[PDB]
Structure 1
Amino acid sequence: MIKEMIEDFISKGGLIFTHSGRYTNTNNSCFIFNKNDIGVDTKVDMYTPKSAGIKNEEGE
């Protein structure tokens, strides 16, 4: 399910971003979602504390 997942994300810290300083330093935790660069094939990152979240029936 998808809504189940979006809400699983929201019960947790719940951040969706396209740019971050988390890659520069893992202790940083700055997450920035730019609106202008979202396109058809724009890959999009998300953050949860310790990457928490349930999987589906196909294990994703």
Structure 2
Amino acid sequence: MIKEMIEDFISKGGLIFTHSGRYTNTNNSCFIFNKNDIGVDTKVDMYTPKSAGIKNEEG
């Protein structure tokens, strides 16, 4: 399910971003979602504390 997942994300810290300083330093935790660069094939990153979240039937 997808809504189940979006809400699983929201019960947690719940950040979706296209740019971050988390890659520069893992202790940083700055997450930035730019709106202008979202396109058809724009890959999009997300953050959860310790990457938590349930999986689907396909894992």
Do both proteins adopt the same fold according to a TM-score greater than 0.5, normalized to the shorter chain?
A: yes
CA RMSD of aligned residues (A): 0.0
CA shift digits 1:2-51 (9 cap, x unpaired): 00000000000000000000000000000000000000000000000000
User: Structure 2: which 5+ residue stretches go unaligned?
Assistant: none
User: Structure 1: which 5+ residue stretches go unaligned?
Assistant: none
2:28 match: secondary structure? coil
Question: Which 4+ residue blocks in structure 1 deviate beyond 6 angstroms?
Answer: none
1:58 match: secondary structure? coil
CA distance in 2, matches of 1:45, 1:30: 12
CA distance in 2, matches of 1:23, 1:41: 21
Identity of aligned pairs, percent? 100
For this pair of structures, how many residues does the alignment match?
59
